[PDB]
């Protein structure tokens, strides 16, 4: 069952913004959100798509393992951290689009389409260019649909090998301390309106797991830090993390 708490809207409006946070308590099988409608509205996944893309690349052998080096192609781009060699871990960490565009080209349209259907991922629609459809093509996914997909990944239930799923969860590692572990991926969609930022993932505790998926209006890049900051403030308010 689902509960809506409209008072949580203050986390976004206090920053002159609008968005949705969706939380899922795995032990209790209960969900919570500030806005049930927006929780089910589908947006471009943008760099959150690097989760399924990594899985497919690993399972087909396009990527050998998390140490394989993807050499910079020598084209200077405006994100300094993209102008260097990467492996799967650093490509995830710095959301290196051109590395994942090469993954998608080697995966190919037919295998990509099949695998997203097998994952039940969003609207499963890869219309557009095979190396950019998650940025400006036809694929869409909602916050609740992100949760459904992430829960399968957590439980090793996606239709790829256990190894592929373990490696991607390693690459999602974002934060860890004595109190919790966060595995997550950010996203920033700008090529189609409305411009939004994403943060999706989960929080591991000693005896429970809380899945989360959030998106928020993002008219400029100045607010990107709000994706993680707001989410962690909700988690702290609900006493999930200290
Ligand atoms: O948060 C994001 O989704 C995002 C979007 C665009 C660029 C970068 C970035 C900046 C510095 C180093 C690496 N990547 C991150």
From Swiss-Prot:
GO terms for molecular function: beta-lactamase activity; penicillin binding. Changing residue 183 to A: No significant effect on catalytic efficiency with respect to ampicillin, nitrocefin or imipenem. Very little reduction in dimerization at neutral pH. Predominantly monomer at neutral pH. Slightly decreases thermal stability. Induction: Expressed from an upstream promoter, P(out), in an insertion sequence IS1999. It catalyses: a beta-lactam + H2O = a substituted beta-amino acid. GO terms for cellular component: plasma membrane. InterPro entries: Bact_Transpept/Beta-Lactamase, Beta-lactam/transpept-like, Beta-lactam_class-D_AS, PCN-bd_Tpept. One of its GO terms (biological process) is antibiotic catabolic process. Belongs to the class-D beta-lactamase family. When OXA-48 is present in clinical isolates of K.pneumoniae, increasing chloride concentration during antibiotic treatment reduces bacterial growth. Class D beta-lactamase which confers resistance to the beta-lactam antibiotics, including amoxicillin, and moderate resistance to cephalosporins and carbapenems such as cephalothin and imipenem; in the DH10B strain of E.coli. Acts via hydrolysis of the beta-lactam ring. Has oxacillin-, cephalothin- and imipenem-hydrolyzing activities. Monomer. Dimer. NCBIfam families: bla_class_D_main, blaOXA-48_like. This is Beta-lactamase OXA-48. It comes from Klebsiella pneumoniae. The lineage of its organism: Bacteria, Pseudomonadati, Pseudomonadota, Gammaproteobacteria, Enterobacterales. The gene is OXA-48.
